[PDB]
């Protein structure tokens with residue numbers, strides 16, 4: 001009694017390559033993706049070095065082509081120095097990512113004028129996504145309107161933010177958004193269990209009312225995306241815990257549990273993990289690609305999922321109903337019951353496929 | 363300087379097969395589709411006999427497999443006798459079509475209770491589309507809510523209707539809609555030129571204010587679809603003119619003209635003729651399929667387009683900028699510069715592809 005799903009897409013992951021400090025890399029992070037029923041990922045640019053220029057993108061592309069086990073696209077990151085310099089490589093990236101709240105020096109924008117410059121210079125037909133919390137959502141929406149183009153808001157986490165976006169959509173404004181599983185299945189009530197170190201994430205865990213508001217406003221949510229952000233326990237439990245949770249291996253089991261409980265439908269799930277990612281980012285179909293899941297078996301999330309090198313999870317102890325049994329990627333068995341079966345380098349950059357270019361006028 | 367588009371989808375066509383009275387059939391109608399840059403069509407069930415039971419669907423499937431030159435899915439039609447009888451074939455159809463205003467005896471529903479019965483018995487995961495004008499839009503939305511499921515509204519044609527749907531979307535209700543080109547590019551102002559016979563269509567041509575309201579509310583429109591409804595001039599100019607316009611060959615040139623004038627973007631067009639049709643009807647990707655268009659050349663729509671056996675067009679005399687140059691369907695050249703190059707029967711029923719089943723829980 002298995003259910004066949006299409007190849008699912010996670011448009012927001014951090015795979016820590018290039019980089020020398022973290023354990024996760026393209027090979028381990030994409031193994032985690034496959035084990036979570038994900039066959040395409042879009043990787044964020046806050047790596048070391050960050051993907052803020054053409055040489056860094058070229059490096060990252062080759063590392064991903066050699067390490068990735070599922071298909072991928074790579075974001076470019078906006079900086080205080082690169083507006084107007086990315087035109088030649090822009091169409092090879094997933095899109096442009098703006099970090100509008102806290103981030104590292106290289107990705108910090110110090111003025112809304114810098115946001116305007118990116119919206120004015122990035123090619124108008126290509127995706128722009130923003131890390132934009134609370135009032136920053138309204139501020140980036142204003143910049144998008146001043147420049148007459150769309151914006152996608154990453155990880156919406158608060159009642160305030162989803163209601164703002166709801167109001168913008170009611171006015172016909174071209175805004176889309178995504179929500180991460182930790183903002184649907186964790187809240188302040190869980191900070192006692194997690195502790196202040198493990199609980200650190202940006203956007204932070206919301207109140208019960210924030211969580212309730214996201215569920216109530218599911219119609220406003222275009223995509224689910226994990227914001228897979230691996231850090232080891234040594235980091236999360238240390239003196240300056242970095243924010244973020246691993247999430248590729250838990251996202252689909254959590255959401256399938258919600259489907260089984262009637263909190264959203266299977267279609268609602270597949271719009272948000274397949275059809276809307278495709279259409280917002282113009283990501284191409286994957287031929288001969290599907291995921292088989294088992295909805296009959298209940299299990300408890302353990303202290304760590306098998307594949308992510310984060311080697312911890314904030315969902316430990318939650319009971320889920322829903323298991324990824326098999327993934328077929330482009331005609332090859334990629335995952336069966338806890339074993340990944342495609343090697344590093346099987347994955348490809350979808351922006352190089354003929355079907356994966358974003359359409360544009362001449 | 364050609365622009366590559368993906369395979370475009372028209373979710374609302376009338377191809378008049380099975381039937382003995384009209385000139386159009388699957389072979390000619392799908393030639394018209396290819397010449398308009400369309401590689402997949404969903405055909406409506408108001409044929410002769412109408413597609414209101416399993417034997418009629420089986421017949422229509424074989425006629426389409428033998429005649430179609432592009433890929434297709436076939437709608438089932440709701441009748442006063444078939445609620446609760448279509449479960450075994452439902453997933454093989456594009457969806458279920460309800461004719462809630464004027465139609466022929468066999469498709470006429472005489473009570474809203476019959477609409478409720480169809481919404482209650484048709485499988486909940488499969489598409490339902492309705493011909494629903496003016497207050498009928500609100501009535502079918504109520505039935506959808508009473509039965510806790512979605513509905514798609516065909517050919518929205520009026521300010522009244524698009525504002526109703528806008529209000530429903532603002533309340534989070536699961537409703538989508540489509541608009542046809544004649545309701546964006548023709549109005550009452552054109553009835554003088556067309557005359558009462560040629561001008562007959564359902565929904566009727568709107569006022570200038572209706573047309574303006576649809577453009578102003580483009581964000582509310584999920585899909586464009588032609589409602590290709592071929593009748594010959596002998597019929598349109600006769601004593602009891604049937605309603606409908608041919609439209610497969612004009613829809614894309616008209617919309618590309620609007621893109622060139624900045625009335626909507628290329629992305630706005632491709633969401634409405636590719637990505638949203640896919641996601642609302644769970645229509646599968648077409649491998650190795652694309653359309654090449656030329657945006658440089660201005661031409662005037664003639665008295666009839668080359669392929670549709672309707673052999674007339676209400677857009678005669680309008681100037682357009684945008685031409686379909688080449689269509690490749692599943693690796694084969696299907697159309698080049700006025701010549702269709704795939705024979706009748708090249709097209710396939712997409713609901714038989716592994717990727718073309720609608721996902722459902724066990």
Ligand SMILES: O=C1C[C@@H](C(=O)O)NC(=O)N1
Pocket residue numbers: 014046131200201202203229230242243244245
């Ligand atoms: O904005 C971010 C980035 C991320 C990371 O660890 O890269 N982790 C977070 O919690 N928020």
Ligand SMILES: O=C1C[C@@H](C(=O)O)NC(=O)N1
Pocket residue numbers: 376408493562563564565591592604605606607
């Ligand atoms: O509802 C319909 C059906 C159609 C036809 O000719 O089949 N033509 C129209 O104008 N309206």
Ligand SMILES: [Zn+2]
Pocket residue numbers: 131154155202203
């Ligand atoms: Zn972020």
Ligand SMILES: [Zn+2]
Pocket residue numbers: 011012129153154155178225
């Ligand atoms: Zn994101």
Ligand SMILES: [Zn+2]
Pocket residue numbers: 012013014044227229
């Ligand atoms: Zn992130």
Ligand SMILES: [Zn+2]
Pocket residue numbers: 022230231232235242
């Ligand atoms: Zn870290």
Ligand SMILES: [Zn+2]
Pocket residue numbers: 278279281282283632637
């Ligand atoms: Zn696209």
Ligand SMILES: [Zn+2]
Pocket residue numbers: 294296297
């Ligand atoms: Zn099982």
Ligand SMILES: [Zn+2]
Pocket residue numbers: 282284354355356357358359
């Ligand atoms: Zn493309």
Ligand SMILES: [Zn+2]
Pocket residue numbers: 493516517564565
């Ligand atoms: Zn109709």
Ligand SMILES: [Zn+2]
Pocket residue numbers: 373374491515516517540587
């Ligand atoms: Zn329709």
Ligand SMILES: [Zn+2]
Pocket residue numbers: 374375376406589591
């Ligand atoms: Zn129709």
Ligand SMILES: [Zn+2]
Pocket residue numbers: 384592593594597604
């Ligand atoms: Zn006729």
Ligand SMILES: [Zn+2]
Pocket residue numbers: 270275640641643644645
């Ligand atoms: Zn689908």
Ligand SMILES: [Zn+2]
Pocket residue numbers: 656658659
């Ligand atoms: Zn030319």
Ligand SMILES: [Zn+2]
Pocket residue numbers: 644646716717718719720721
């Ligand atoms: Zn399918």
